[PDB]
Each structure stands twice: as structure tokens, then as C-alpha cells.
Amino acid sequence: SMNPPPPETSNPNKPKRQTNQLQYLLRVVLKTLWKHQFAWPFQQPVDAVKLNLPDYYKIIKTPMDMGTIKKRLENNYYWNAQECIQDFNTMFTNCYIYNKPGDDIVLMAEALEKLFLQKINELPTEE
Numbered sequence: 410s411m412n413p414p415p416p417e418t419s420n421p422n423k424p425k426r427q428t429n430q431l432q433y434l435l436r437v438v439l440k441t442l443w444k445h446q447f448a449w450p451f452q453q454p455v456d457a458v459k460l461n462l463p464d465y466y467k468i469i470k471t472p473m474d475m476g477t478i479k480k481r482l483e484n485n486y487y488w489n490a491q492e493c494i495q496d497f498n499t500m501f502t503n504c505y506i507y508n509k510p511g512d513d514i515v516l517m518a519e520a521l522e523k524l525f526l527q528k529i530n531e532l533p534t535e536e
């Protein structure tokens with residue numbers, strides 16, 4: 410029932426870069442999803458205490474949220490686009506694992522994921 414430390418967003422000895430694809434993931438992908446009417450449950454780590462989800466972090470062992478992704482992008486935490494793409498996919502998958510079909514939160518994730526997929530389809534080639 411207690412909350413874990415959030416995923417890290419800073420790690421000085423981790424290798425990191427700026428790439429044009431990572432710039433796109435911030436300026437286009439993250440910004441598109443962040444402004445969406447259904448973004449709010451995903452804009453910070455799941456607070457299992459406030460939301461009364463005592464089993465959440467017993468089930469979800471790789472938590473991820475857009476708050477974390479946003480900070481990672483702003484802090485240039487990533488080495489490549491695939492790392493960031495994986496974080497988004499982890500976020501969506503967690504939602505589908507924990508919840509059941511047709512739940513409001515799943516409909517919300519599905520809407521965000523559709524947009525995500527549309528934007529990642531237009532990911533620029535590197536350099």
C-alpha cells in the first residue's frame with residue numbers, strides 16, 4: 410500500500426544525448442499527449458495511497474508516467490529514441506495490465522495511445 414520512490418530522472422554517469430528524434434519526442438509527442446483532455450491521470454506517478462490502490466505496486470513492477478517522461482526529456486536523460494518510446498509503451502501497458510477492459514482509465518489510455526502511435530509513425534530519420 411505504500412508508494413515507491415519515483416523512477417529516476419537524473420543520473421550523471423548514465424550516457425545521454427540529444428538527438429533530433431528525442432527533440433521530436435518532446436516537442437511533438439509528449440506535448441501532444443500532455444495537453445489532451447485525458448492526460449491528467451498520467452501526468453504523475455500513480456499515488457497508490459491517495460487513489461486507494463494498495464495492490465498497485467505489488468502488480469506493477471515497472472511503473473512509468475508522463476511526468477517522469479517529461480522530466481527525462483527536459484533533463485536530456487535518454488541515449489536514444491527507443492528508450493523514451495519504451496517508457497511510453499510501459500505506461501500504456503501497465504494501465505492495461507492493472508485495469509480491466511472498458512474501464513474509464515483504459516479508454517483514456519487508448520485515446521492517448523492512438524495519438525502516440527500516429528505521432529511515432531511520423532518519427533523523423535536520425536540526424
Ligand SMILES: O=C1CCCN1c1cccc(NS(=O)(=O)c2cccc(F)c2)c1
Nearest residue numbers: 450451455460503504507508513514517
Ligand atoms: O492505472 C492507472 C494509471 C494512471 C492512473 N491509474 C489508475 C487506475 C485505477 C484507478 C485510478 N484512480 S483515479 O482517481 O486517477 C481514476 C479513477 C477513475 C477513472 C480515471 F480516469 C482515473 C487510477
